Design an enzyme around this catalytic site. Structure first.
Site, PDB file in Angstrom:
ATOM      1  N   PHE A  53       0.824  -1.198   0.000  1.00  0.00           N
ATOM      2  CA  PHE A  53       0.000   0.000   0.000  1.00  0.00           C
ATOM      3  C   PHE A  53       0.861   1.251   0.000  1.00  0.00           C
ATOM      4  CE2 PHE A  53      -4.328  -1.723   0.641  1.00  0.00           C
ATOM      5  CZ  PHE A  53      -4.010  -3.063   0.849  1.00  0.00           C
ATOM      6  N   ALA A  54       0.577   2.143  -0.937  1.00  0.00           N
ATOM      7  CA  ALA A  54       1.290   3.408  -1.029  1.00  0.00           C
ATOM      8  C   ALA A  54       0.249   4.520  -1.150  1.00  0.00           C
ATOM      9  CB  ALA A  54       2.250   3.399  -2.206  1.00  0.00           C
TER      10      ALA A  54
ATOM     11  N   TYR B  16       3.103   8.163   1.143  1.00  0.00           N
ATOM     12  CA  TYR B  16       3.913   6.947   1.065  1.00  0.00           C
ATOM     13  C   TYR B  16       4.180   6.483  -0.365  1.00  0.00           C
ATOM     14  CZ  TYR B  16       4.063   6.118   6.127  1.00  0.00           C
ATOM     15  OH  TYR B  16       4.296   6.239   7.484  1.00  0.00           O
TER      16      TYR B  16
ATOM     17  N   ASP C 290       4.703  -3.970   4.305  1.00  0.00           N
ATOM     18  CA  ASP C 290       4.753  -2.511   4.419  1.00  0.00           C
ATOM     19  C   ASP C 290       5.552  -1.960   3.237  1.00  0.00           C
ATOM     20  OD1 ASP C 290       3.391  -2.580   6.888  1.00  0.00           O
ATOM     21  OD2 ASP C 290       4.895  -1.402   7.956  1.00  0.00           O
ATOM     22  N   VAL C 291       5.299  -0.702   2.885  1.00  0.00           N
ATOM     23  CA  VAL C 291       5.967  -0.078   1.738  1.00  0.00           C
ATOM     24  C   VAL C 291       7.229   0.684   2.144  1.00  0.00           C
ATOM     25  CG1 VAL C 291       4.786   2.162   1.786  1.00  0.00           C
ATOM     26  CG2 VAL C 291       5.579   1.195  -0.410  1.00  0.00           C
ATOM     27  N   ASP C 292       7.285   1.111   3.405  1.00  0.00           N
ATOM     28  CA  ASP C 292       8.390   1.944   3.898  1.00  0.00           C
ATOM     29  C   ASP C 292       9.625   1.088   4.188  1.00  0.00           C
ATOM     30  OD1 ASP C 292       6.769   0.841   5.944  1.00  0.00           O
ATOM     31  OD2 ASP C 292       7.692   2.161   7.449  1.00  0.00           O
TER      32      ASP C 292
ATOM     33  N   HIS D 218       8.452 -10.155  14.853  1.00  0.00           N
ATOM     34  CA  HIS D 218       8.658  -8.711  14.980  1.00  0.00           C
ATOM     35  C   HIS D 218      10.080  -8.474  15.475  1.00  0.00           C
ATOM     36  CE1 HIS D 218       8.101  -4.553  16.310  1.00  0.00           C
ATOM     37  NE2 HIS D 218       6.877  -4.552  15.814  1.00  0.00           N
TER      38      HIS D 218
ATOM     39  N   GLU E 230      -2.037  -5.068  13.517  1.00  0.00           N
ATOM     40  CA  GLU E 230      -1.042  -5.985  14.049  1.00  0.00           C
ATOM     41  C   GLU E 230      -1.572  -6.744  15.267  1.00  0.00           C
ATOM     42  OE1 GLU E 230       2.759  -4.619  16.190  1.00  0.00           O
ATOM     43  OE2 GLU E 230       3.460  -5.353  14.231  1.00  0.00           O
TER      44      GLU E 230
HETATM   45  O1  LIG Z   1       2.036  10.271   9.759  1.00  0.00           O
HETATM   46  C1  LIG Z   1       1.590   9.102  10.334  1.00  0.00           C
HETATM   47  C2  LIG Z   1       1.352   7.938   9.435  1.00  0.00           C
HETATM   48  C3  LIG Z   1       1.397   6.581   9.773  1.00  0.00           C
HETATM   49  C4  LIG Z   1       1.095   5.682   8.688  1.00  0.00           C
HETATM   50  C5  LIG Z   1       0.790   6.320   7.476  1.00  0.00           C
HETATM   51  C6  LIG Z   1       0.513   5.655   6.126  1.00  0.00           C
HETATM   52  C7  LIG Z   1       0.755   4.284   5.957  1.00  0.00           C
HETATM   53  N1  LIG Z   1       0.577   3.715   4.764  1.00  0.00           N
HETATM   54  C8  LIG Z   1       0.783   2.214   4.599  1.00  0.00           C
HETATM   55  O2  LIG Z   1       0.547   1.448   5.861  1.00  0.00           O
HETATM   56  C9  LIG Z   1       1.759   0.826   6.188  1.00  0.00           C
HETATM   57  C10 LIG Z   1       1.952   0.974   7.683  1.00  0.00           C
HETATM   58  O3  LIG Z   1       2.257   2.245   8.146  1.00  0.00           O
HETATM   59  P1  LIG Z   1       3.702   2.501   8.718  1.00  0.00           P
HETATM   60  O4  LIG Z   1       4.709   1.832   7.756  1.00  0.00           O
HETATM   61  O5  LIG Z   1       4.024   3.976   8.791  1.00  0.00           O
HETATM   62  O6  LIG Z   1       3.685   1.849  10.137  1.00  0.00           O
HETATM   63  P2  LIG Z   1       4.885   1.435  10.980  1.00  0.00           P
HETATM   64  O7  LIG Z   1       5.732   0.392  10.292  1.00  0.00           O
HETATM   65  O8  LIG Z   1       5.733   2.634  11.256  1.00  0.00           O
HETATM   66  O9  LIG Z   1       4.391   0.900  12.320  1.00  0.00           O
HETATM   67  C11 LIG Z   1       2.784   1.555   5.401  1.00  0.00           C
HETATM   68  O10 LIG Z   1       3.937   0.820   5.217  1.00  0.00           O
HETATM   69  C12 LIG Z   1       2.116   1.784   4.115  1.00  0.00           C
HETATM   70  O11 LIG Z   1       2.006   0.643   3.349  1.00  0.00           O
HETATM   71  C13 LIG Z   1       0.248   4.449   3.703  1.00  0.00           C
HETATM   72  O12 LIG Z   1       0.201   3.871   2.573  1.00  0.00           O
HETATM   73  N2  LIG Z   1       0.060   5.771   3.818  1.00  0.00           N
HETATM   74  C14 LIG Z   1       0.207   6.407   4.998  1.00  0.00           C
HETATM   75  O13 LIG Z   1       0.006   7.611   5.085  1.00  0.00           O
HETATM   76  S1  LIG Z   1       0.939   7.982   7.793  1.00  0.00           S
HETATM   77  C1  LIG Z   2      12.944  -3.906  24.077  1.00  0.00           C
HETATM   78  C2  LIG Z   2      11.497  -3.470  24.318  1.00  0.00           C
HETATM   79  C3  LIG Z   2      10.771  -3.414  22.977  1.00  0.00           C
HETATM   80  C4  LIG Z   2      11.440  -2.402  22.044  1.00  0.00           C
HETATM   81  C5  LIG Z   2      10.679  -2.416  20.710  1.00  0.00           C
HETATM   82  C6  LIG Z   2      11.305  -1.421  19.749  1.00  0.00           C
HETATM   83  C7  LIG Z   2      10.565  -1.446  18.399  1.00  0.00           C
HETATM   84  C8  LIG Z   2       9.081  -1.087  18.536  1.00  0.00           C
HETATM   85  O1  LIG Z   2       8.493  -1.108  17.229  1.00  0.00           O
HETATM   86  C9  LIG Z   2       7.067  -0.858  17.203  1.00  0.00           C
HETATM   87  O2  LIG Z   2       6.414  -1.920  17.883  1.00  0.00           O
HETATM   88  C10 LIG Z   2       4.987  -1.736  17.888  1.00  0.00           C
HETATM   89  C11 LIG Z   2       4.398  -2.882  18.706  1.00  0.00           C
HETATM   90  O3  LIG Z   2       4.972  -2.777  20.019  1.00  0.00           O
HETATM   91  C12 LIG Z   2       4.459  -1.703  16.456  1.00  0.00           C
HETATM   92  O4  LIG Z   2       4.793  -2.935  15.821  1.00  0.00           O
HETATM   93  C13 LIG Z   2       5.136  -0.546  15.751  1.00  0.00           C
HETATM   94  O5  LIG Z   2       4.664  -0.486  14.377  1.00  0.00           O
HETATM   95  C14 LIG Z   2       6.648  -0.814  15.786  1.00  0.00           C
HETATM   96  O6  LIG Z   2       7.365   0.248  15.141  1.00  0.00           O
HETATM   97  C15 LIG Z   2       7.571   0.119  13.742  1.00  0.00           C
HETATM   98  O7  LIG Z   2       8.581  -0.899  13.641  1.00  0.00           O
HETATM   99  C16 LIG Z   2       9.820  -0.551  14.314  1.00  0.00           C
HETATM  100  C17 LIG Z   2      10.823  -1.707  14.146  1.00  0.00           C
HETATM  101  C18 LIG Z   2      10.410   0.711  13.715  1.00  0.00           C
HETATM  102  O8  LIG Z   2      10.769   0.502  12.346  1.00  0.00           O
HETATM  103  C19 LIG Z   2       9.387   1.796  13.897  1.00  0.00           C
HETATM  104  O9  LIG Z   2       9.843   2.985  13.266  1.00  0.00           O
HETATM  105  C20 LIG Z   2       8.113   1.402  13.180  1.00  0.00           C
HETATM  106  O10 LIG Z   2       7.197   2.475  13.405  1.00  0.00           O
HETATM  107 MN   LIG Z   3       6.252   0.337   8.191  1.00  0.00          MN
END
Ligand SMILES: O=Cc1ccc(-c2cn([C@@H]3O[C@H](COP(=O)(O)OP(=O)(O)O)[C@@H](O)[C@H]3O)c(=O)[nH]c2=O)s1
Ligand SMILES: CCCCCCCCO[C@@H]1O[C@H](CO)[C@H](O)[C@H](O)[C@H]1O[C@@H]1O[C@@H](C)[C@@H](O)[C@@H](O)[C@@H]1O
Ligand SMILES: [Mn+2]
Ligand SMILES: O=Cc1ccc(-c2cn([C@@H]3O[C@H](COP(=O)(O)OP(=O)(O)O)[C@@H](O)[C@H]3O)c(=O)[nH]c2=O)s1
Ligand SMILES: CCCCCCCCO[C@@H]1O[C@H](CO)[C@H](O)[C@H](O)[C@H]1O[C@@H]1O[C@@H](C)[C@@H](O)[C@@H](O)[C@@H]1O
Ligand SMILES: [Mn+2]
EC number: 2.4.1.40
Lengths: 289, 296
Positions: A64-65, A69, A154-156, A176, A246
């Site tokens: 997803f983008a 993103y 995830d796309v990022d 994770h 999640e």
């Molecule tokens: O500014 C806060 C945002 C948090 C998620 C956003 C978002 C995520 N996504 C998708 O959901 C996935 C999960 O969001 P995330 O990668 O930012 O989540 P984390 O991996 O940081 O927990 C992304 O990889 C994308 O595929 C989007 O396509 N558009 C977005 O604006 S925007």
């Molecule tokens: C040692 C104690 C525990 C220390 C844990 C440190 C990583 C925490 O991680 C977050 O964990 C959450 C669930 O609890 C979600 O999965 C969130 O998306 C994830 O952050 C995502 O994945 C991470 C890997 C990073 O890439 C962060 O930027 C992302 O937003």
């Molecule tokens: Mn992500």
């Protein structure tokens, strides 16, 4: 296709597996339900490649983008071309609110990309969670007649190393990166019994990451539909799970054991977590955001 | 049945698997094609029992007792009742030339036995080898309709500990007790290139025992049919493989990788090989057999 029976391999020359001298003695390589846990050193990719090529395996990859993103797509796709299922048939499915913003990426032979136009939700949590609904809908609409396996990520992110058919199986989750060494009471499961994603402190095998899961189209359809339905129940009850999709993913895989589990090689953040000795390869990693 | 999809488990309380502290560090617990190698300490039997009970799994167990080998049946069956798939549906298939010599053994609920009268070959080698043809034949005649999984074993054996649903999978073989620690060059594969069972010294994963293999009925039908056909080709070419059906089983499993491999816990001879530390349990073991020998 997914063959119903074992396939017959040609003669191959490779090192004999040694029953009394396992390579990986530092990590658990099998779950208590006898599903492999995939680390470097546990598989021979030549044998696995032969097995899957002989079935003419097609792999779908959803990503997803949405909104800003779309910026992550160029690197994601370019690195997937170098590292993801190379040698096999790949169908990329790019979900976006901006079809015109999808970068023109040159693809290797046997690989194709489809752009799926979807709604952009306002809350980032909804963007993330609604992926379950959108995947489940398209498992029916398209994937069932188009691919053998689905990989949902995830796309990022970017690929840095091999991600291949070693992951394919009816249903997989990924450890994770933040929690693979944690005890279950420390896992950030949803802990409110009022939520459908509830898991009490004495249950739980692993903490799976929402950023990387998959399996056969039918198992992924079931998982994503189940997660979406549970999220809708929560919404009706005025509750949103602590870690959104999640949390529900984790409730699903607790009750429905995955047939393979991927190690954090497959889902890493080097900035936050470095490069531990236990990771021989960093395969699929976070891009700064 | 064999469920098409993953089953949903009830809440269960059990020790958390520890990613960073594996229990078995002394043995390979997964093959290079990502099939589990089944050893004590690698599985939680409560989880597996739930998964398989939820599918109302029925397991067939085939055993040949031709000529004097009927003597092995009473102990085989009595110990199977104590250790084999207890709690699950079981169907014993006793292939014999002497239906009337099958001992009466009381069976637990959900368990039953069928006696399949078959021909007795003169040569012991043919008795052993024709098991493949006979198993394949009855897969079509009986097994496909009656059971989900087939387990095919030697009769000159007894169960001494748990053998359960941890072994069930589309296709499995068992590490032969004499060779689990050997290099592939010391494996007693058929070494003649003219044999269908030929495996050169630079090939081979494991040496599997002919006394214990199995899988889904469909995969076992395919294996047994293929092994029989290979033996018939060898015969037409005036060749007999050095270890008969076991040689062809090894050729088949070299080219069609099993989805589980069982450790020698599941096929052992304590008199011959003692009890190495790597075996925490002896589950299915050899019974003395020199008295049931018949000269060709
Ligand atoms: O500014 C806060 C945002 C948090 C998620 C956003 C978002 C995520 N996504 C998708 O959901 C996935 C999960 O969001 P995330 O990668 O930012 O989540 P984390 O991996 O940081 O927990 C992304 O990889 C994308 O595929 C989007 O396509 N558009 C977005 O604006 S925007
Ligand atoms: C040692 C104690 C525990 C220390 C844990 C440190 C990583 C925490 O991680 C977050 O964990 C959450 C669930 O609890 C979600 O999965 C969130 O998306 C994830 O952050 C995502 O994945 C991470 C890997 C990073 O890439 C962060 O930027 C992302 O937003
Ligand atoms: Mn992500
Ligand atoms: O005097 C030599 C014999 C060698 C095998 C014989 C035999 C084997 N069998 C079956 O073949 C299987 C394999 O033969 P085996 O156990 O004697 O030999 P191994 O494969 O353990 O070396 C037995 O377990 C029986 O199921 C019989 O039913 N009747 C027999 O007379 S008789
Ligand atoms: C490198 C040192 C290797 C040393 C190996 C020592 C055990 C050899 O074993 C025989 O192996 C043959 C294949 O090579 C056949 O499978 C035969 O049926 C088996 O004997 C059967 O199984 C045995 C366990 C005994 O129960 C024997 O009585 C049986 O006839
Ligand atoms: Mn025997």
């Amino acid at each position: 296709a997914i063959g119903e029976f074992m396939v017959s391999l040609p003669r191959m020359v490779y090192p004999q597996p040694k029953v009394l001298t396992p390579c990986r003695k530092d990590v658990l390589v099998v779950t208590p339900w006898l599903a492999p846990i995939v680390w470097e050193g546990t598989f021979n990719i030549d044998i696995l490649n032969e097995q899957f090529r002989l079935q003419n395996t097609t792999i779908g990859l959803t990503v997803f983008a949405i909104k800003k993103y779309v910026a992550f797509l160029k690197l994601f796709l370019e690195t997937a071309e170098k590292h993801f299922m190379v040698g096999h048939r790949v169908h990329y499915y790019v979900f976006t609110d901006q079809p015109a913003a999808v970068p023109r990426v040159t693809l290797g032979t046997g690989r194709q990309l489809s752009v799926l136009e979807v709604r952009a939700y306002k809350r980032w949590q909804d963007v993330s969670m609604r992926r379950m609904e959108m995947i489940s809908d398209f498992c029916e609409r398209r994937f069932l007649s188009e691919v053998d396996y689905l990989v949902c990520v995830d796309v990022d992110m970017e690929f840095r190393d091999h991600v291949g058919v070693e992951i394919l199986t009816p249903l997989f989750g990924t450890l994770h990166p933040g929690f693979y060494g944690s005890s279950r009471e420390a896992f950030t499961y949803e802990r409110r019994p009022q939520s459908q994603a509830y898991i009490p402190k004495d249950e739980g095998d692993f903490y799976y990451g929402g950023a990387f899961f998959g399996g056969s189209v039918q198992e992924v359809q079931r998982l994503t539909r189940a997660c979406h339905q549970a999220m809708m129940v929560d919404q009706a009850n005025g509750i949103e799970a602590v870690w959104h999709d999640e949390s529900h993913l984790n409730k699903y895989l607790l009750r429905h054991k995955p047939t393979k589990v991927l190690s954090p090689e497959y889902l890493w953040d080097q900035q936050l977590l470095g490069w531990p000795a236990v990771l021989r390869k960093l395969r699929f990693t976070a891009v700064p955001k």
